[PDB]
Amino acid sequence: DVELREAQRDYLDFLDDEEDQGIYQSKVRELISDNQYRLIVNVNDLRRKNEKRANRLLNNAFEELVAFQRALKDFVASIDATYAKQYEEFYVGLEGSFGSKHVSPRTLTSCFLSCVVCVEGIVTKCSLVRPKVVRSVHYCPATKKTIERRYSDLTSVYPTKDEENNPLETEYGLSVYKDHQTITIQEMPEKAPAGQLPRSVDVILDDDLVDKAKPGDRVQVVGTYRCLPGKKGGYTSGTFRTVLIACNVKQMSKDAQSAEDIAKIKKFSKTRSKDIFDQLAKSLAPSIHGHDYVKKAILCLLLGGVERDLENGSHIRGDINILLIGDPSVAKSQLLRYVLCTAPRAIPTTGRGSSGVGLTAAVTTDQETGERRLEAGAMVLADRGVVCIDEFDKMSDMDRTAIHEVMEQGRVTIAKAGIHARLNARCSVLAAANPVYGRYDQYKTPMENIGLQDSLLSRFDLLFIMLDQMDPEQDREISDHVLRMHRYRAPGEQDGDAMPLQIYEKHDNLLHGMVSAAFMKKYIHVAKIIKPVLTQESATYIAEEYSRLRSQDSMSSDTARTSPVTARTLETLIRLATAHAKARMSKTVDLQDAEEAVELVQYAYFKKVL
């Protein structure tokens, strides 16, 4: 086959990346070093190096991918034959910019059959992983003969009797299976037209991809679109069943996860080892003005404290739960929106938009196998993440009491007669609230300005009252900030048109009169891994502070507690202190972190009553 030989030669030449930037040679070194047998190749590279090869690969996926994989196996054999001998086949995944192939399940028309398609969609079905045999081995006790039979990928006869009718006992251990799964993906409800029902498509996942995507996750699947046949039969209808044989599955949450950036982070941490936390917090939500303490507290929510697992298996949560009660138009919902945009695995929700079994996980019947199955609820999905609950007050109290366990111990215990489980929900809850009566009556105690019972207020470690004080100077400042924001226009990209349906950022005068959001994201992500240890002086300081906080004297006349001070408060201090330590890469919770958390708690837990 001249065409196939040419394709393989071109692909091998591409993979032979030493004269060029050495990107794919390094990628092959990566895949061999970490012991995986699938390579991911950016299509943009094929377009940049050979447009004919890229077009052929995209328009005729099957044979081109076969040639590419064979060239990949040859190249890995050349670089190392020992590893290359381990795996029968080396697979390939694609990614990049798919000009016209990038579509959704709705736009997926029969025109793309036998082509390469990079679809984006919401996963609806994930079937059980089954081992599909590819090579069977059968042993005959009578004849002592071991017979191997191959099973080509024809996406059938299984031998049982020898030539002279001697029973064959299959050798399961020596047989070769590849794990295989089928999922059903759907077009994102956001981009689907509001009127008609959702449109979906099947996807078939071989090894290395069987469980790369879980139900109810927004994913991008790159693969080949082909037609399935019916079973043997004299008559057939022109109808054909089409699936997307995936070559790569990726989580669209690129936010979920270089030496230059690491060096930048190290230098930024070491430069001023005192006020990095304040500089970050001030830069947390640039569009919003004021609320320095609230921004500080949120910065602690993003970092979070440190979880403690004792020898007895006891669990002490290391996440920080924050509540923001506010008069109308004080940017609490805007802060929740920012947390959604920035914090990874930030699950939004609203008061009555998630009732009972939807907010937390649920249990149903499979309805096909008759077997009970769990249902990842709104918050169990938010494990190791943030849950932004807006309009918290309007929730039915049943839902509220259905959050205490996840808020405190971070696990949801659900059990019906058939099945029982304790799903992991280690999420930090950021709740927004409009105080009873709509607006905050400063001439009433914060206790009666909040309709929540004492226990739930205890659940929240920090409770911020954000009043709509109109101090004319403060109103002038807020108006200046807002109007400057409303005037801002994107640099160069815009010139008076409308919107269709580095450590430090450049200092604009219309936004400043701070640190980059991307740099802030990277620094926060790296800092979140640090695990500081409390110091003896810090422990004594926090203990004394908690002792006074419980003491009546800590509150003067006409000042009331915004929430009861109990054991949790103490942990909050630690957690908050821990958070402040993580901002400085401290690795040791010194006194500065403890006292900063202490002042934060003192500000949060007492309100002056007029």
Binding site: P189, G353, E375
Partner: protein, 227 residues
């Protein structure tokens, strides 16, 4: 039963009022009713019942008029008498402001929300009907949704097919346009909270036992009400 083909697929969506020109045909599948073959139409022509540069220049010159605001103000509810300020405000709502997304990613809605409280005598439901008939994308509805057409979107999972069916309310259907809510004071608690979120953020966040999501409802609300 209609049967489409290469380019006729998805030229219509359920609910369209259509005129179909096709070949009256029966199924041909390997051959008390006897010899009855289910009949269907082979669709060949579809007509769905209900900007040129000249019109672009027409709009350009219309805007350039010194009193463009006045002519627009007097050109929305000519039949309705009085209420010039209300008509000006409704024109402003129709044109809307500008949506802003700051570099941090936060969005400032550019769609105006208007409310009209008054005695039941004034022509305000008529005004809402005109607004829904004049806005490019617009939907009229009552406080408690409409007739078999909810106000806000809902999500349910088909127990058989197990999909995520999104039953669209007036808000999501009216994305990028106007929703005229008559009797805006008689909503239901769930809908009250939903609109509470939507009118400011422009998004309806719904999380069911299946999935969490945030439908985009960038609608300008025009509400009518009595004391």
């Amino acid at each position: 039963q209609l049967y489409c083909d290469r380019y006729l697929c998805d030229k219509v969506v359920p609910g369209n009022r259509v005129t179909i020109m096709g070949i009256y045909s029966i199924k041909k599948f390997g051959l008390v009713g006897v010899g009855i073959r289910s009949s269907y139409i082979r669709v060949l022509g579809i007509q769905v019942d209900t900007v040129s540069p000249q019109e672009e220049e027409e709009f350009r010159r219309l805007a350039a008029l010194p009193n463009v605001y006045e002519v627009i103000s007097k050109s929305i509810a000519p039949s309705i008498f009085g209420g010039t300020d209300m008509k000006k405000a409704i024109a402003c709502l129709l044109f809307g402001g500008s949506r802003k997304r700051l570099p941090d990613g936060l969005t400032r809605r550019g769609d105006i929300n208007l409310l009209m409280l008054g005695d039941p005598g004034t022509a305000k439901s008529q005004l809402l009907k005109f607004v829904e008939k004049c806005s490019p994308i617009g939907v009229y509805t009552s406080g408690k949704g409409s007739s078999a057409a909810g106000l806000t979107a809902s999500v349910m999972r088909d127990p058989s097919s197990r999909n995520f069916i999104m039953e669209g309310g007036a808000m999501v259907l009216a994305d990028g346009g106007v929703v005229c809510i008559d009797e805006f004071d008689k909503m239901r608690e769930d809908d009250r909270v939903a609109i509470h979120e939507a009118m400011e953020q422009q998004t309806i966040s719904i999380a069911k036992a299946g999935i969490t999501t945030t439908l985009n409802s960038r609608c300008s609300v025009l509400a009518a009400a009595n004391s």
